[PDB]
């Protein structure tokens, strides 16, 4: 399999910037969602999920084909709750129908991040919708009840090393877990709609208590009212992960640089960018444009 990036016919930077602005304006307006968290989080999750199905071995999965739009994928149990981000984007797609699905799902993720004060994430267009039969089977997304070995192992399928994994996981500071969705419940910290290194701080400074929740699943709960999944917790159990957590707990910039590179890589896995391809775009935030 080769997925070559193909620019949507005749579109350019400015075209993309408008999709971005549209997404951002909607994020701004629909702030009541999930009790005032806003849709930032969910979109980030969405972007990650359409991309985590990737298999470095045979190049199936990944964000290129927008397969999430098909039943198989859309109905994947690991994707429960994502339908709300989809619905959020639907009107957008209506407004700019020439954008591919994979471009759109991934763009929301980027938009989200940057709108929530995170770092700028360069992004590339070119994804191409693929047929229903390209939709990967369910089960390619990781489980939360495991440990560090699982995580290392899992992420390797995506070519991500230890540093990437830890950076990437720092997104856990956002939003929260929801009972109905994954059998987990609770936020991980206080600023759950603004992008910070809070994740790492929490993991290191709170006093975590292992407990079972209402779905009969175990989770690490803190006095402050926060939670961490076992997979999150596992970043402190592994010596190698641990030193990284510590690094980011100490330097928000490092964290941002690292996250930025990783997230893009994550969203570009399995895609071949030809030579003539435009460079990656760096979008302006609403605020940068005074809108
Ligand atoms: C071991 C790896 C991962 C596991 C097992 C994990 C699994 C989960 C779980 C169980 C949920 C809660 C869903 C719900 O009930 O709403 C979720 C929340 C979330 N996931 Fe992950 N995830 C991990 C990797 C990632 C990474 C790489 C990203 C993005 C870079 C990410 C971003 C998020 C976000 C932003 C939320 C909050 C969603 C909301 O507020 O609706 N996670 N994670």
């Amino acid at each position: 399999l080769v997925h070559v990036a193909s620019v949507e016919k005749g579109r350019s930077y400015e075209d993309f910037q408008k999709v971005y602005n549209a997404i951002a304006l909607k994020l701004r307006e629909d702030d009541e969602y999930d009790n005032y968290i806003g849709y930032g989080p969910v979109l980030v999750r969405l972007a990650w999920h359409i991309s985590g199905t990737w298999d470095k071995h045979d190049n199936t999965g990944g964000s290129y084909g927008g397969t999430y739009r098909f039943k198989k994928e859309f109905n994947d149990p690991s994707n429960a709750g994502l339908q709300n981000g989809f619905k959020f984007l639907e009107p957008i797609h209506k407004e700019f129908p020439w954008i591919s699905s994979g471009d759109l799902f991934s763009l929301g993720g980027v938009t989200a991040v940057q709108e929530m004060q995170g770092p700028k994430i360069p992004w590339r267009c070119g994804r191409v919708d693929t047929p229903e039969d390209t939709t990967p089977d369910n089960g390619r997304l990781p489980d939360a009840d495991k440990d560090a070995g699982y995580v290392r192992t899992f992420f390797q399928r995506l070519n991500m090393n230890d540093r990437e994994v830890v950076a990437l996981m720092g997104a856990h500071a956002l939003g929260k877990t929801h009972l109905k969705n994954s059998g987990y419940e609770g936020p991980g910290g206080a600023a759950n709609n603004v992008f910070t290194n809070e994740f790492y701080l929490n993991l290191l400074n709170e006093d975590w208590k292992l407990e079972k929740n209402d779905a009969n699943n175990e989770q690490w709960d803190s006095k402050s009212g926060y939670m961490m999944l076992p997979t999150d917790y596992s970043l402190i159990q592994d010596p190698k992960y641990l030193s990284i957590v510590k690094e980011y707990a100490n330097d928000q910039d490092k964290f941002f640089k690292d996250f930025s590179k990783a997230f893009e890589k994550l969203l570009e896995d399995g895609i071949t960018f030809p030579k003539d391809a435009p460079s990656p775009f760096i979008f302006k935030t609403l605020e940068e444009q005074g809108l």
Side-chain angles (χ1 to χ4, degrees), residues 1-8 10-13 15-89 91-93 95-179 181-222 224-256 258-275 277-291:
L1 264 164
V2 193
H3 291 307
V4 181
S6 178
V7 181
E8 289 101 327
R11 304 297 166 180
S12 61
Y13 175 64
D15 297 283
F16 293 103
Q17 185 65 82
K18 294 199 265 214
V19 178
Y20 175 109
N21 291 174
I23 287 167
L25 291 159
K26 195 188 197 338
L27 277 171
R28 173 199 287 175
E29 160 183 274
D30 298 3
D31 62 353
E32 295 211 332
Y33 183 76
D34 212 354
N35 70 261
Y36 308 90
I37 283 162
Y39 284 88
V42 74
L43 291 195
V44 160
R45 201 182 181 232
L46 182 43
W48 130 256
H49 270 217
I50 57 90
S51 293
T53 50
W54 194 68
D55 197 330
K56 55 151 84 162
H57 295 112
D58 61 6
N59 213 29
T60 55
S63 72
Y64 183 97
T67 52
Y68 171 76
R69 89 206 182 247
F70 297 121
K71 268 351 130 57
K72 206 208 254 140
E73 192 165 342
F74 191 74
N75 293 331
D76 182 356
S78 309
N79 288 334
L82 292 183
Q83 45 278 101
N84 300 308
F86 183 69
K87 288 150 222 259
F88 178 96
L89 299 172
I92 281 140
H93 212 181
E95 215 152 320
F96 309 79
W98 49 261
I99 186 158
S100 67
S101 295
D103 275 6
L104 180 61
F105 296 154
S106 64
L107 179 57
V110 177
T111 310
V113 168
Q114 303 195 169
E115 293 292 305
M116 279 181 303
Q117 285 157 258
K120 289 304 194 77
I121 314 279
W123 165 99
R124 307 173 90 142
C125 61
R127 315 167 168 81
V128 184
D129 297 12
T130 59
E132 195 162 358
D133 48 294
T134 57
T135 306
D137 297 83
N138 296 168
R140 296 205 175 196
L141 291 171
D143 287 341
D145 52 345
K146 268 54 185 184
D147 60 4
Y150 173 86
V151 163
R152 189 172 273 112
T153 281
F154 175 90
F155 274 110
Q156 250 301 283
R157 208 189 61 223
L158 323 165
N159 254 300
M160 296 286 178
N161 64 10
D162 292 344
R163 151 160 333 257
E164 296 168 332
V165 170
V166 182
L168 281 180
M169 207 81 44
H172 275 175
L174 312 163
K176 69 187 291 277
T177 67
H178 309 80
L179 218 71
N181 311 153
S182 57
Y184 301 78
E185 179 60 36
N192 55 340
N193 70 8
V194 33
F195 206 92
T196 74
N197 70 344
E198 193 191 350
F199 182 73
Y200 307 107
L201 297 152
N202 290 1
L203 227 32
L204 305 163
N205 308 136
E206 292 276 307
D207 162 50
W208 311 95
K209 247 64 249 161
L210 176 71
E211 256 147 72
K212 278 214 159 116
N213 62 31
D214 299 306
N216 218 29
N217 293 313
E218 318 242 22
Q219 57 176 73
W220 293 95
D221 296 322
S222 104
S224 308
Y226 310 142
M227 65 69 86
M228 283 292 171
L229 300 157
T231 48
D232 301 310
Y233 202 63
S234 112
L235 307 180
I236 62 192
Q237 301 173 310
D238 180 278
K240 272 153 159 191
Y241 281 155
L242 198 237
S243 45
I244 304 160
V245 162
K246 302 214 178 157
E247 181 178 348
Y248 301 147
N250 244 269
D251 172 29
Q252 185 171 284
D253 315 318
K254 182 58 185 204
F255 170 48
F256 284 9
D258 300 358
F259 185 81
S260 181
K261 278 149 31 211
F263 198 51
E264 179 172 8
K265 157 170 184 182
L266 172 77
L267 299 175
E268 287 176 3
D269 280 341
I271 311 159
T272 306
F273 290 97
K275 205 231 176 225
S279 303
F281 304 134
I282 280 107
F283 302 110
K284 292 268 193 47
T285 59
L286 277 181
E287 168 179 346
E288 271 150 3
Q289 315 164 258
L291 304 171

